[PDB]
Write a protein that binds this ligand. Structure first.
Ligand SMILES: Oc1cccc(O)c1
Ligand SMILES: Oc1cccc(O)c1
Ligand SMILES: Oc1cccc(O)c1
Ligand SMILES: Oc1cccc(O)c1
Ligand SMILES: Oc1cccc(O)c1
Ligand SMILES: Oc1cccc(O)c1
Ligand SMILES: [Zn+2]
Ligand SMILES: [Zn+2]
Lengths: 30, 21, 29, 21, 29, 21, 29, 29, 21, 29, 21, 21
């Protein structure tokens, strides 16, 4: 099941909300 | 990284904030 | 304003889709 | 930046890919 | 402003929920 | 089409059902 | 199941974005 | 894996669409 | 509650409507 | 009004995340 | 309430918390 | 179909285009 990929989708929405005008770097693999 | 930390167990918004610019 | 805030929400989703394993930097600016 | 470029008129996924890492 | 584009994004989510196993065509125009 | 019909006044889930296969 | 339900929700959003003006057809089997 | 959390996010979206102007209470408890 | 009802198996839109105000 | 409908969809997702275990009460009227 | 407050300008996270239970 | 192809592993954007009209 594609769980990590679907989880990442929610993670970026949560970063968008919390980081505000700072923005964020999403770096899945690292 | 974030996927390891946050897709296994729930991260709070405070925890997620550590990934902000 | 709110329109840009809502738009930004969709932008990050489209970036997530298109950038794949590379990821992306989002800066409102 | 991205909001200026892409919130007034539509950006294709190809145009958005410019913002990838 | 990209309002029709953003609306369509919400529309397809609504159609997904309403249509269930029937599925749907989305044909903008 | 659906965008014209539903992007100014809200289409109910009941109305949206007409677009299902 | 649930899982497949949640997955389909993300699938329709990706189709919406990648298909653009073409639109798409979503038919869970 | 945080599927209850992820399921909840989709659940509130679905509730939002079903409830309309009625609104809703969401309690995970 | 709703998470137990609706996250183990899929709730129909009618079942969801239970939770409206 | 669709604009309010789309905004509300984003509102409930943000409330979902920020309220956590408290849950929330969405009452637009 | 929330629509008049938060759909007309961007609400902060603390402002959104007013609507938590 | 799409659920079998794309919910068991991650579909590429090209694979997703199979389902465009
Ligand atoms: O731990 C997580 C994973 C995904 C979204 C989120 O808000 C928290
Ligand atoms: O121009 C845009 C704005 C938001 C999402 C998107 O896919 C394109
Ligand atoms: O009229 C609409 C527009 C977008 C989503 C929806 O559920 C209804
Ligand atoms: O049972 C559920 C869970 C999440 C969304 C939905 O439409 C149904
Ligand atoms: O004012 C708002 C409206 C929608 C989402 C959000 O986080 C804030
Ligand atoms: O395989 C998938 C599943 C969901 C979204 C996506 O872009 C790809
Ligand atoms: Zn999801
Ligand atoms: Zn939106």
């Amino acid at each position: 099941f594609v769980n990590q990929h679907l989880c990442g989708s929610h993670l970026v929405e949560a970063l968008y909300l919390v980081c505000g005008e700072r923005g964020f770097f999403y770096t899945p693999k690292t | 990284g974030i996927v390891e930390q946050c897709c296994t167990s729930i991260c709070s918004l405070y925890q997620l904030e550590n990934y902000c610019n």
